[PDB]
Design a protein around this ligand. Structure first.
Ligand SMILES: Nc1ncnc2c1ncn2[C@@H]1O[C@H](COP(=O)(O)OP(=O)(O)OP(=O)(O)O)[C@@H](O)[C@H]1O
Ligand SMILES: Nc1ncnc2c1ncn2[C@@H]1O[C@H](COP(=O)(O)OP(=O)(O)OP(=O)(O)O)[C@@H](O)[C@H]1O
Lengths: 609, 115, 618, 115
C-alpha cells in the first residue's frame, strides 16, 4: 500500500549552499555575470538570422560595467535579449530552468553555439559580493520589469514606472557587502575581466568617470583591444605580427616568439590550441579556456615538466564538464590533450630542425629541455633522439646531430662512440683517446653533465650501441705484431704482476697493450662497466691499468725490475705516482687529492736542487 | 515536441548512449540498421529523437533500458579496432549531442588496465 | 504596484547537478553514507544520557557493510537512531533539512558533537554509483518504513510488511550502475573505508562470505581494530607502545618512531595533531616534489585531504603525521578547506611545535646522532630555505673539528671555545673527512691557536651561505682572512720580508699571465709549498667545483724549501725561462687541485709530471 | 523556540557577528555591557539567542543591521592589541557558535598590506 512523494529541496539553505560553500576566490561573480550576459547577446544575435527587426531596438551588441560608488552600486549593462516578466520569474528558480533550453533544441541547419553555460546557478553567485540585487530587464517582447532580491526565499517583480528606459537587454545593479567595495575600483575590474572574461565575443565596455575640477570627464573605455581570440580564425588568416602580437599580450613578454604552432584536434575531444616557443629562457603557461571563458591554467597535466617553457593556450567547445567552473574533473581528458600537445609540439621542433641557424638559436636556448625530455620519456626517446646536437673529432667548430654520425661510420662498425667530461677543450686535443682517433672512427664531445644523464637511457640507438671508456679488440691486425704480442708482452710479464702489487687492491689486471704509443700510461675502466667519466658524473651528483711499452719512461721499469722488485726505497714515490697521473688522464676524480700533490713537489727534490 | 540531450562514447566493439529526462514513460524503440529513433514523453514534455549513425551498428545484439532521471542504450559496431570521429553522418555542430566524458576514453581502450 | 514570488529551484536538474557535476573520484558515496551513519549512532548515543531505555532496542552501536552480488546490491546496516515516516519524508528533501537541527539547538551542559555533516546533500551522492536506492529504517518512534527512489523527481514510502525486521536504525540498499560492481569487491570496500572513514567513532563492520568447505560460513568482521584516533585522548593517557603502534598503522612502517609529538592548538583555529620523527630515512629521495604527502588531514573525524606543501615545508617532508579540527575550516563539498589562510597558520604551528621536538631530541647523547645520521640533510636544507628559524635551526647543526676529530660538535659549543680576542667563526669545506683533516692546507691556523670545522657534505656550504651572521659571529674560510697584531714581531717584518719576495711577486704573476689577480707570499701557511685562495666575497673553489659540477689569488709559503730556490733563480732567470717553463705553471697547477679544484686543463699537467722524471732519475 | 547559528572573529579593536536566517522580522535589540540577546522571528520559526561575552564590549559605539538571508552585528572592545580565545565566557563546546573564516584572520590583523 504505497504513497509517492515529490522531492522538494528548500531554498534558504540551497542558496547559502551555493554562495557560502566557500571558494576563497570570489571574484567569479563578475566572470559569471558577464558569461550570463554574453549568453544574452549571443541569443538575440542568432535570433536575427530569420528576423533582424528584433535588432532594431538596439543596433549595438555590447556589455557595459558602470561603477557607481556614491550609492555603492555596481551596474552591469547588456544589450542582449533580456527577459519578459515570465522569463524573469521562471528562469530565476535555481538550477532547473536555464538559458540552455534556448540551445537544447536549436538543432539549426547552421546551429552556432558561441554561448554555453548551464547548471543554472552562476547568477546567484552575485550574492557572494552583493547584499541585495537589482535586475532591470527589457525585452522587445514585454515592458521594463524590475526583479529584486536579497538572497532570501523570496523575490519581487514590478513594472518599472520611473527609472531611465533601455532599448533592449538587461542592467544588473549590485549593492555590495559593505566591504566588497574592492569591486568599485577601476584597476580591480580591469584585473578581473581582463583575465577571466578576456576573450569574449562581445565588447567589454567600462565607464570610468575621471577628474576635471579646477573652479568631471567620464570615459566609456576599455575596448582594449587586444582582446581578440587568435584561435577562432584560420591559420592562413594570420601570419607573424598577429601571432607574435598575441603572445606578447598573453605572456607580458617583450621579445618575439621564436616559433608558433596554431592547430586543432577534432573527433570527440574537439579543442583548438596556440603554442609558442619563446626567444629566450627565463630564470602556469597553457592557460585553458572552455567556450571562451577562462578555466584554469596549469603545468603537469597537459605539459610534461621538460616542455615547461612552451607558452600556449587551449580551448574546447565540448565542455570537458567541470564541477562548478574551475577544473574539468576528469583527468582522462587531461592525459589526451597532453599526448597531442606533445606529438604536435614535437613535429614543431622537427620543423625548426629543417634550418641552419634558427635551430642553433633554439638549441642554445633549450639544449637542456630536449635532453631532459630524452631522460624522462620513452616513446619519444627516439623521436627526440634525432634532435640532439654535439661536437665531434670530425667537426670541431661545427654542430652535429646523430643521423649524420650514422652515415659517417663504415659497415665494419656497429657501435656509436662518445666520451664526456669537464669542458670542450678539457678532452678535445687530449691524447686520452688518440688511439681511437688514429683508429679511424669518431667520438663526440658531451660537455654538459645532463647529456650523460640522458645517454644512459639509450644503450640502443637505431640498433647502434653507445660506448665510451672502455675495452676494445680487432682481428689480425697486420699479423706481424699480433705475432709478437704474446712474446713481447711476456717481456713485461715479470713487470706485469710487480706493478699490480705496489698498488695492491684497486685494479683488476695490469696490462701493457699497444693500443697506445708514447703517452706513458692509461686507465681503461673494464668493459660492461660504467665509464671513468660516467662514474665521475653518476657519482658527481648523488678497472684496468694499461701501460705503453715503447714509452721511454716505461723501459726504465723493466731495467729496475731486476734492480728492485717486491719492495722499494726510491721507487715508492713513483710507482703509485704515475698510476695516479694516468688516473686523472682517464677522466677521473680527485680521489686522494692531497697525497698526489705532495709527490709532485717531492719529485722536484733530486732533479733540480 | 521537445528534444532530449545525448552522448557519444566509442570503445573497442561498441557505442553506448545516455539520453536525459526525468521519469519518462513509454520508451519508443526504434533500432534501424543505420538510424536511432525515440519518442518517449516524461511524467508533461513530449520528447522525440532521431539520429543517422556514422556506421553500421548491429540491431541484433543491443539492449535498451532505463536507469533513473536518463535513458540508456548500447550497440556493437561492424569492425575490429577502429574509432568514430562522431556519432552522426554529417557536420556536427549539433547542440544537443555532447560527449559523455564519464564513459569516454578511446586511444587507451583495453590499454588502461594497468598499474 | 509590486508582486512577491517564492524561489522554487527544481529537482530533476538539481540532482543531476549534485551527482553529475563530475568528481572523477566517485568512491565518496561510501564515505558519505558512513558519515551519515556515524551521524545516526552519534545521535542515539547522546540521546541516552537522560533516557537509556532508548538503547534497549539494540544494545550495540555499529555499522555493517553487506555485499550481495547475487542481486547486485550493496547493503549498509547501521544501528543508529533511524527515521520515522515523517523523518524520512521531511529530511530527504535536498540541502535544507539536515540532521544538524538536532545539533543546531543542542546547547547542552556538556554538548558533545562527535557528529558533523551539513549541506544535507551527501546522501544523494549514492546515486553516483547506484541506479536505484532502497532505504529501510526503523526508529523506536515508529514502525519499519521503506523509502525508495531512482534519482527521479519522486520518492515512495511504504510500511515494510515482509522483509526481516531490525532492532533499531537503518539499512541502505544500493543497486549499483551495471558496471560499478567494483564496489561489491572485498578489497575495494576495504580500500575505500580503511582510507576515507578509518577513524570513525564506530566499529566498521563488514560481512564477507568466505568458505573452507570440502569439495558457507558468513563472518561479521573488521572490528579491525586500532582504528581508534589517538589524538582524542589525553597525552598522559598514552605512552610508548600506543603512540608507536599508531604510527605503524598510519604509515605501513616496520620500525619504531624515534620520537613523537602529540599536541593541540586552540583559540579560533582549534586543531589537534600527532607527528612522528621516524627511525630511518625512507630511503627514497627526495625533492622530486612528485611524491610527498604524509600529513593526512581530518575534519571532525572524517578524512579530508592529505598533503605536503601547504602545512609542511619541503624539508620537513619525512614527518609522518595527522591533523584534525572540529572547527570545520569549511570545505567546498568535502575535499579541501578552500581557505589557504587556514593552511598557513597550521603550518606555523606544525613547524614551531615540531622544532622544539628536535630541540628536545637534542637533549640526548646518542639518540640525537641516530636522528642526525637520518636527517643531517633535512635540517641543513631547512636552514637554507627558511629565515626566521634559521637561528633556531642553527644550534641544531653538528660537525667535526680540529679540536674534536672522532667526536660530534654543535656550534653553541664552538662559541664558548673561542677567546674574547676572536669574533669570527672559522670553517673549511671540501671533498672528504680526511681529504682536509691532517692536511697542512691550514696548519698556520691550527698552530694559530684557533679552531676549524669539517664540512664534508656539499649541502653544508649551501646553507652556511645564508649565515654570514651567527650570534654576531661571522663565518669564514678558504676565501680570505685577517687578524690583528699577532705578536707584533712578524707583523713587524711582514712588509720588509714579503718585500724580499717582491721582485719574485710580479715575476710569478707573469708566466701564468691572466688567471690570477695577485700573487702573494703570506705566512698563513708553513711548509706546504703553495696555495690557491679564491678571493673574498667570491664563491669557494670547492663551491665552484660543485655549482659548476652540476649546471682567485695565489699564495706562496716563503719558508718552503722549494720556494727559496725561486728567489735564487729570480736573479739567474726572470721574465722568460728554458728549464723553468715546465715548473712555473706546474706548481700553480699542483696548488690548484690542492685548493679543492677541478681538472682544469687535465692533459698538460700529467705530461709535466712524467717530464720531470727526466733529469732526476734517468 | 529555535536557535540561530553564530560567528566569532576578533580583529584589532572589534568583534563582529553574523547570525543566520531568512527574511527575519522585528530584530530584538539587546546591547548588554557583557551580554547579547535577540528574539527575531523569520518570515514561521521563532528564534531567540543570548550570549555571555568574553570581555567588556562598548554598548555605546555599535551598529546592528540586516543584510539578507543573515543578521549582522559589530562592536569595539576595551583594550589595544589583544585577542579573544572565544566569544563566550565558558567551556566552548557550543554547537551553534562556529568561526566565520571569511572575516577571521588574527595574528596578522593590520599585518597584511604587502604582496
Ligand atoms: N544578461 C542576461 N540577460 C538575460 N537573461 C539572463 C542574463 N543573465 C542571466 N540570465 C538568466 O539566467 C538563466 C540561467 O543563468 P544562470 O547563470 O543562473 O545559469 P546559466 O547561466 O544557465 O549557467 P551558469 O550557471 O553556468 O551561468 C537564464 O535562463 C537567463 O534567463
Ligand atoms: N542513517 C540515517 N539514520 C537516520 N537518519 C538519517 C540517516 N542518514 C540520513 N539521515 C537524515 O537525513 C539527512 C542526512 O542526509 P544528508 O544528505 O542531509 O547528509 P547530511 O549528513 O545531513 O549532510 P551531508 O551528508 O551533506 O554532510 C539528515 O538530515 C538526517 O536527519
Amino acid at each position: 500500500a504505497s504513497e509517492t512523494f515529490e522531492f522538494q529541496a528548500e531554498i534558504t539553505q540551497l542558496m547559502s549552499l551555493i554562495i557560502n560553500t566557500v571558494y576563497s576566490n570570489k571574484e567569479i561573480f563578475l566572470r559569471e555575470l558577464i558569461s550570463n550576459a554574453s549568453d544574452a547577446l549571443d541569443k538575440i544575435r542568432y535570433k536575427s538570422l530569420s528576423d533582424p527587426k528584433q535588432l532594431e531596438t538596439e543596433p549595438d551588441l555590447f556589455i557595459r560595467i558602470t561603477p557607481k560608488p556614491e550609492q555603492k552600486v555596481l551596474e552591469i549593462r547588456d544589450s542582449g535579449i533580456g527577459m519578459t516578466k515570465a522569463e524573469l520569474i521562471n528562469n530565476l528558480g535555481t538550477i532547473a530552468k536555464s538559458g540552455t533550453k534556448a540551445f537544447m533544441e536549436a538543432l539549426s541547419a547552421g546551429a552556432d553555439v558561441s554561448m554555453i553555460g548551464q547548471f543554472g546557478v552562476g547568477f546567484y553567485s552575485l550574492f557572494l559580493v552583493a547584499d541585495r540585487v537589482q535586475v532591470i530587464s527589457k525585452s522587445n517582447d514585454d515592458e521594463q520589469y524590475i526583479w529584486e532580491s536579497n538572497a532570501g526565499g523570496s523575490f519581487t517583480v514590478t513594472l518599472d514606472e520611473v527609472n531611465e528606459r533601455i532599448g533592449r537587454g538587461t542592467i544588473l545593479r549590485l549593492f555590495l557587502k559593505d566591504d566588497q567595495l574592492e569591486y568599485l575600483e577601476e584597476k580591480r575590474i580591469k584585473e578581473v575581466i581582463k583575465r577571466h572574461s578576456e576573450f569574449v565575443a562581445y565588447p567589454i565596455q567600462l565607464v570610468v568617470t575621471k577628474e576635471v575640477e579646477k573652479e568631471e570627464e567620464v570615459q566609456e573605455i576599455e575596448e582594449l583591444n587586444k582582446t581578440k581570440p587568435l584561435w577562432t580564425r584560420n591559420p592562413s588568416d594570420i601570419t607573424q605580427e598577429e601571432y607574435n602580437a598575441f603572445y606578447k599580450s598573453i605572456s607580458n613578454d617583450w621579445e618575439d616568439p621564436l616559433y608558433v604552432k596554431h592547430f586543432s584536434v577534432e573527433g570527440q575531444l574537439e579543442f583548438r590550441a596556440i603554442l609558442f616557443i619563446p626567444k629566450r629562457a627565463p630564470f602556469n603557461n597553457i592557460k585553458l579556456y572552455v567556450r571562451r571563458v577562462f578555466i584554469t591554467d596549469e603545468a603537469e597535466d597537459l605539459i610534461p615538466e621538460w616542455l615547461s617553457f612552451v607558452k600556449g593556450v587551449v580551448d574546447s567547445e565540448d565542455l570537458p564538464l567541470n564541477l562548478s567552473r574551475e577544473m574539468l574533473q576528469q583527468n582522462k581528458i587531461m592525459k589526451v590533450i597532453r599526448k597531442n600537445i606533445v606529438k604536435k609540439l614535437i613535429e614543431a621542433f622537427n620543423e625548426i630542425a629543417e634550418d641552419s641557424e634558427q635551430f642553433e638559436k633554439f638549441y642554445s636556448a633549450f639544449s637542456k629541455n630536449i635532453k631532459l625530455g630524452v631522460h624522462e620519456d620513452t616513446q619519444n626517446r627516439a623521436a627526440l633522439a634525432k634532435l640532439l646536437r654535439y661536437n665531434s673529432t670530425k667537426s670541431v667548430d661545427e654542430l652535429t646531430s646523430l643521423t649524420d654520425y650514422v652515415t659517417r661510420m663504415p659497415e665494419h662498425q656497429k657501435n656509436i662512440y662518445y666520451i664526456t667530461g669537464e669542458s670542450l677543450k678539457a678532452v678535445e686535443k687530449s691524447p686520452f683517446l688518440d688511439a681511437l682517433k688514429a683508429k679511424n672512427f669518431e667520438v663526440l664531445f658531451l660537455t654538459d653533465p645532463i647529456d650523460e644523464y640522458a645517454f644512459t637511457q639509450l644503450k640502443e640507438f637505431e640498433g647502434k650501441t653507445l660506448v665510451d671508456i672502455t675495452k676494445d679488440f680487432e682481428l689480425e691486425e697486420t699479423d706481424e705484431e699480433k705475432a709478437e704480442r704474446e712474446k713481447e708482452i711476456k717481456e713485461y710479464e715479470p713487470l706485469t704482476k710487480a706493478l699490480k702489487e705496489i698498488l695492491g687492491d684497486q685494479v683488476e689486471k695490469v696490462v701493457v697493450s699497444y693500443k697506445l704509443l708514447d703517452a706513458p700510461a692509461a686507465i681503461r675502466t673494464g668493459q660492461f662497466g660504467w665509464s671513468a667519466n660516467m662514474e665521475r658524473i653518476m657519482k658527481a651528483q648523488a678497472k684496468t691499468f694499461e701501460i705503453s711499452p715503447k714509452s721511454p719512461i716505461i723501459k726504465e721499469l723493466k731495467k729496475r725490475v731486476d734492480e728492485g722488485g717486491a719492495q722499494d726505497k726510491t721507487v715508492k714515490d713513483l710507482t703509485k705516482l704515475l698510476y695516479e697521473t694516468a688516473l686523472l688522464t682517464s677522466g677521473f676524480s680527485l680521489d686522494e687529492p692531497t697525497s698526489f700533490a705532495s709527490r709532485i713537489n717531492r719529485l722536484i727534490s733530486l732533479g733540480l736542487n | 515536441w521537445a528534444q532530449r540531450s545525448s552522448t557519444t562514447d566509442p570503445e573497442r566493439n561498441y557505442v553506448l548512449i545516455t539520453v536525459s529526462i526525468a521519469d519518462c514513460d513509454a520508451p519508443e524503440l526504434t533500432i534501424k540498421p543505420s538510424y536511432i529513433e525515440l519518442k518517449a514523453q516524461s511524467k508533461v514534455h513530449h520528447y522525440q529523437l532521431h539520429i543517422d549513425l556514422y556506421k553500421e551498428i548491429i540491431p541484433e545484439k543491443t539492449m535498451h533500458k532505463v536507469a533513473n532521471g536518463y535513458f540508456l542504450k548500447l550497440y556493437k559496431k561492424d569492425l575490429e579496432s577502429e574509432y568514430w570521429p562522431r556519432l552522426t553522418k554529417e557536420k556536427v555542430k549539433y547542440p544537443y549531442i555532447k560527449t559523455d566524458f564519464d564513459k569516454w576514453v578511446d586511444a587507451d581502450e583495453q590499454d588502461e588496465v594497468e598499474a
